[PDB]
Amino acid sequence: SIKYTIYNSTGIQIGAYNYMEIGG
Amino acid sequence: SIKYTIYNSTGIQIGAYNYMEIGG
Amino acid sequence: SIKYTIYNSTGIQIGAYNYMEIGG
Amino acid sequence: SIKYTIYNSTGIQIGAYNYMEIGG
Amino acid sequence: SIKYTIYNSTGIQIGAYNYMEIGG
């Protein structure tokens, strides 16, 4: 019974074995 | 019974082995 | 029983081995 | 039993080995 | 048993090895 809610965000990854790089 | 909800967002990836790069 | 819902978003990728670049 | 629903969005890619570039 | 539904959107690509560029 898990529920996710996202508002006004940037850079969402939903899955496995993903790669993300965030730069200033 | 997982549920995802996204509003007014940018850059959504749903899957595996994805790559994402975010720059300021 | 997974369900995804997206509203008023930009840049959605649904799949594997995708590449995404986000610039400010 | 996966279900995807998208409303009023821009730039949707559904598949593998896709490339996406988002600019401000 | 995957099902995709899209409403009132812009710029949909369904396939592999696609390229998409989004400008502000």
Side-chain angles (χ1 to χ4, degrees), chain A residues 7-20:
Chain A
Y7 304 83
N8 318 99
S9 295
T10 307
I12 296 98
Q13 275 180 338
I14 302 173
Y17 303 97
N18 297 322
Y19 183 102
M20 186 183 283

Side-chain angles (χ1 to χ4, degrees), chain B residues 1-20:
Chain B
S1 46
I2 320 166
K3 185 181 286 185
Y4 304 83
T5 320
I6 296 167
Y7 304 83
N8 318 99
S9 295
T10 307
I12 296 98
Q13 275 180 338
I14 302 173
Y17 303 97
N18 297 322
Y19 183 102
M20 186 183 283

